[model samples]
Every structure is written in C-alpha cells, then in structure tokens.
Target: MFKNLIWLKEVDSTQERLKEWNVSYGTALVADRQTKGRGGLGRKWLSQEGGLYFSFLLNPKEFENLLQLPLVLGLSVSEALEEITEIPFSLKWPNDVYFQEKKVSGVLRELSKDKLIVGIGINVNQREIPEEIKDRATTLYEITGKDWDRKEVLLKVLKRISENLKKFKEKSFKEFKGKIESKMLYLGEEVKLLGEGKITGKLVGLSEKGGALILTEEGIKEILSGEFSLRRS
Candidate 1:
C-alpha cells in the first residue's frame, strides 16, 4: 500500500513534515533523525542518528474506526520485528511495542485537516539510550549486537502495516481484537490508568472499537476515550 516513499537526513518532526507536504495516501516520509519526535501522552522522544523515525499519510475515510489504528500499528511493528530479528515482541497498550518490559517502538497519530498523519519511532540501532529511560528501553541493535539498515527495517515494518491495515479495513477490529489482546504486554496484570480520576484494574483486553477493557473494583470498564497513561502497578 506504500505508493510513494521519501527519506530525509533529518526532520523536525515526521508528523509536521507530513502535515506540511501535499502527500497522498500511502505516502511515507522517513528521517534518519528527528529534532521534534514525540511519544504518547505528549512525551518527548529522544532521537539521535540511530532510530527509525517516520510518518505516513492515510485517508481517514478508508477506515471506519480511528481508535483501532494505533493498536494495529503496534501489532504490525511487533510482528515485523519478530520476523526480522527473530525476537519476541508485544504491545504496551495504546501504542507502544516492547520486548519483555523494555519499549522498542511507539506510534502516534494526528489529524491534519482532512488527512490522518501517523508517526512511528523504532529504536533500531541507537547505541545511546538516554539515562531517563535507558533502563526501560531496548533497541534492535542492542538485542542483535549489530547495526541494521534503517531502510530495510522501514520497508519491512511498512509492509506489515500496509498488509495489516488491509486486513483491518476489510474485516474491521474483529479481525485483530483477539490477536492484539493476546499480544498485549500486561494482560491479566494489575495496572493503574491515570486520567482525571485514577482507574485501577487488571488489564483485561480491548473493546470492539479499541478501548482498554479493564477489570476494575466496580466492574470491567471500557476506557474508550480520555487522556490516560497506562502504568503497571
């Protein structure tokens, strides 16, 4: 589904680049480094020279539910990593990928007028992980003990995402609900979700439209929307 592809030495933010350019669906913009990378919940993502930072344009009308795209991207990235590096990977709820407890990739999507611009960052070969998150993050280079060609990684990941989104567009979230739930990082584990009010529960699964279905003290609550961060407790 990647019809057009472009790469640059560095971009302030792939998200911003995609927004600035007149890009078509499946047009993906990649950067060797990003000056303004972002993570979920507006967290600053450190980007040097060795991370896969990119954004792709998509037409929101092609898909029914926007909520499921992040989960789908997360699933696509993990599967692609597993195929490329022969390593086990999982999803960290809303939009992060992990190998065990350490994060390896994250997805962030934004709406720019009529387009859905999605950004993704994968720690493929960054030797230096900032001290702030060094212990909680892992890179593909760190796991494999060698450098990886960023384009190769990007192509593989984009392929998986393109294919997965095809499946999603045809079958909707039902096609991936169980698969994503099984691949979720903290399934059946206790967690604290911080929003306006705290929601403590067991990470159960996902709702039909991609909400976090948590089993709380009151009942199994479906968190469909809100500014909440998932924390393992």
Candidate 2:
C-alpha cells in the first residue's frame, strides 16, 4: 500500500531518523545514504550511496516475547532476498545475513521507549567493498553477477517483514525456535562473544521465551547479543 515512500539524500542514520520522526508504529524510514551507521556491540557499520539502509518501528509487546523479533527479521530478510535473487545466503547468530562465508546484510534492533526500532543494511548495486571489509562484507552483484532494482528489493523485504510480524503476533516464537536453531551458523560451536571477547562456549541453541543463546562453557551459560559474544574456533 505504501507505493510512494519517502526518500532521503543524507542523514545521520535511518535508525536515528526513525526515532526522531517518532515513526507511527509501523512506518519505515529509508535513505539513499547514512552518514553514521551503527552496529551491534557498539560497532560502526559502514554505509555508502551504493547500499540500502533503513529502519522501521514496531512494538514487540504484542508478541509473546522479544526473542523472536530478530529471528523473525532474519528469516524475513533471507526469504525476501531469495525471492528476488539466486544468491546463497544464511543467518549468523543474533541477526547477520551471510552469503557463502561472508556477510551480505546486517540487522540491528533497538528499543526506544515502547517502540522497537529495526535497522537493516544490504549491499544492493555496489560492485565492490573496501579491502578491509571485503573479506567480511559482500554485495548482491558480486555474488549473483547481476544488478537488481532497489525499489523491488525494498518492497519485497517490507512485505515479508509484515508477514513475519503477523505470524509472530498470532502464534509464538516457540514453534519457530526449532527451525531458527537449525539455521544458526555456529550453534554448539566455539565463537567470540562481542564484548566478553575471547570466551569459548558451545551454543546449546536459542531460548524462545527469552532472547538468549543457551550456551554451555564450563557449565551452563546464557549469552545475550548485547552482553556476550562467542569466539569462533
């Protein structure tokens, strides 16, 4: 229904813009360029004119829990990209979208007051990434050898997100937790927890009722995306 959406030339960050605008519960804030993009664990996410960056507001209280929000967004992004391109992609823990062994997209969600702000960045028509990030970052054209319409990709992703929102509100994250765990890239493997830095832990899987990576290090552990990181071995 939102065929003619608003566009921006430059902004601090779409996530910040969404917060400033006080997005009407479900309104999405998209931009051509983000001057200062942020990532999880207080990292800086690089953004340029060639990629797509945006954020939308939501309220997770309607859902049974908040754990499923990132899962829902991850799956929605994967399915949406697959629908338009023939690229190999999967999800890394938390909510990173990977193609082959490299990351192609990333999703960052933040809670402002009672609203949930979801920020997503995907490499669209960009042909190359910086050398420093090249090994870790990838783009659609580089993977598929084809350029795609940004508008089309945006619409598809938005639709899928809407569907995911509906499903989450109806049922619960419990039913999808099994499938989500199966898609996890490093479940039960030793990896670095972002801030905790070099802690080796085996991911038992995810807890649907709460947003945590059920981990077992020396014993049992629960890792939150904002608090911990699993060091990849």
**lDDT values, one for every candidate:** 0.83, 0.70
Clash pairs for candidate 1: none
lDDT of 2 by residue, 107-142 (tens): 888877677788888877876567767777788988
Stretches of candidate 1 off by over 4 Å are 40-45
Query: Of the candidates shown, which would achieve the greatest lDDT relative to the real structure?
Result: 1
1-233 per-residue lDDT for model 1 (tens digits): 77458989887888888888887788789888777777642335545778888899888778645568889989999998999989889888788998888889888888867888889989898887777787788889998899998888888899999999998887778888888888888889999888766899898888877899889888998886636667888
Q: Name the lDDT value of residue 30 in candidate 2.
A: 80
**Candidate 1, residue 188: lDDT:** 91
- Per-candidate clashes, comma-separated: 0, 10
TM-score to true structure, per model:
0.94, 0.85
- Please give me the total number of clashing residue pairs in predicted model 2: 10
* Model 2 ranges off by over 4 Å: 1-4, 40-45, 63-66, 196-198, 210-217
